[model samples]
Target: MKRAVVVFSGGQDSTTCLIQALQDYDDVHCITFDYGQRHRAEIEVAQELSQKLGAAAHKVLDVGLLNELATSSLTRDSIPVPDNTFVPGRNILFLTLASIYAYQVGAEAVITGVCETDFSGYPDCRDEFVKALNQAIVLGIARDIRFETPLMWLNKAETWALADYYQQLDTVRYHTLTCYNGIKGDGCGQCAACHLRANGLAQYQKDAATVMASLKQKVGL
Candidate 1:
């Protein structure tokens, strides 16, 4: 049985990654970080989703120091979140911590939901950065740790398609929270994160409906 660790945040993308990890690996563990982001509700959501998804182990680690070091809008109350929420070294720290946990658990892979195609322009979210970090981790630890980014090449609409492909569209729609405003479920629908998610979901639904319509027409239904 292949064991894997997923860096879960209880957001739409991470939740989808968790679902995929569960499907692909026999044993799946989840790690959620408490970095003192503006939206602390996401940690609660992460806990709930990890339990509901039946992860082999769900650990919430405290890295509150990140908030201290991070001057980004996500950590600083004075700074507003959105386009300015790019916290330096955030993904690097996340991957490093997750890799450490994976090493302890004898896991072969660490899964993350960082997407480059549909993102908030975070440099760390880029595929090249992740690839470089993956190589660094392997060399630094002298372990063959595979960092998996299932959504790296996917647009937001395509991410929705992936969730639907895994039969988790409803779970993502109603259960996951992607708002930077701390709102749950559908969220405030006003923040940058909400706008991205909403637009993608709307597009995916429209495309799916069109496909169904075409199929029905073909069958003369």
Candidate 2:
């Protein structure tokens, strides 16, 4: 019974990762961080979903130090949340912290949903960064730990397709939050995050329709 720790944020990507991990891992735990972002709503959603998914445990760690170390659109009250303002080493710090926590709990696999293609110029979300972090963590720990990013190459549409593939598409659409404006489900349909997500979803729906039509034809319906 291998165990895993998920960097669950209750966002579109993270929730999909959570669902995927639940299907594979015997013991799955969730860890979220609060960094004074406008989208604190995602944290609340993470809590609820962790419970619903029967995660072995869930922890909300306060990295409010982020507010001091990196003042950007996300943490600063005066600074406009630029689509790329908070592009420092956010995921790096987070995954590092999560790695430490996971190591403490004897979790060999750490899961997250950080993707690079649809990412808003966030370097840390890149595959290279994740690969480097994986190397650093393994060397730092002198242990064989694997960081599993289930959504590395995926765009938002492919991410949705993944949820649909798992049959959790409806739940993810209604529950996950991807809005930079703090709005949930369908979001504000305006912000950069929302726009990208919307486009991805629209593409996914079109592909899904094609697939269904093919299926119907095959079934002679």
Candidate 3:
């Protein structure tokens, strides 16, 4: 039986990836980092969702030290969290740390949902970056560690549909926290993150309806 470790943030994307992990892996574990974001409430949501989804266990690592190292919008006292807060090398550092943690716990795979298309132009979410970091991880650990990003090329709408394809749509909507302001379920609605989630949900609903109609037509009941 193969085991996997997921870099979960209790957001829609991470939760969707978690469902994907559960479907594919024999043992799934979740790890979240407390990076001193204003929406720290996501840590709590991660805990609850991990238990509900029956993960092996969810570990909330205290990497709030990152807040000090990277002085950007996400972890600064003066800077305001903007629509495009691209702190340099954030995901690289994150994925690297996650790889180390996963290796320590005997996990061969580290799963994340960092997508390039729907992201706020974060460079680290790019496929080339992930592939390079994964190569580094394999070499550094001298082991068979693979980084699995299932939604790397997916748009937000496609992400929602894929989560639903794995029967995680309701759980992601009600349980995950995508709000920059920390509001759960539907979120704060003001931030760019909230807007993307809302738009994706609408698109997903339409796509699901079309799929159902097609299925009904095929059945001809």
The most accurate candidate by lDDT is 1
Q: Candidate 3, residues 1-221: lDDT per residue as tens digits?
A: 68899998888888888898898889998988776753455577688788899799888888765555544634456655433333568788788888888888899899988877764668788889889889988998888889888777666777777677777788888888888888876998999999999998887687776644443343232
lDDT of 1 at 67: 62
When sorted by TM-score, best at the front, the candidate numbers are: 3, 1, 2
Worst 10 residues of 1 by lDDT: 212-221
Residue-wise C-alpha lDDT for candidate 2, range 108-215, written one tens digit per residue: 899988766653658887878888889988999887789887777666777777778678988888887788887777899989888888898898887876644443
RMSD of 1: 6.4
Candidate 1 C-alpha error for residue 69, in Å? 1.8
**Which runs in model 1 stand beyond 4 Å of their true positions?**
38-42, 71-86, 209-221
TM-score of every candidate: 0.83, 0.82, 0.83
Worst 10 residues of 2 by lDDT: 212-221
Give the per-residue lDDT digits (tens) of candidate 1, residues 84-203.
Answer: 333477889999999999999989999998876653668887889998999999988879989998877666777787778778889998888788877776799999999989898887
Model 1: colliding residue pairs: none
List per-prediction Cα lDDT, in the order shown: 0.81, 0.79, 0.79
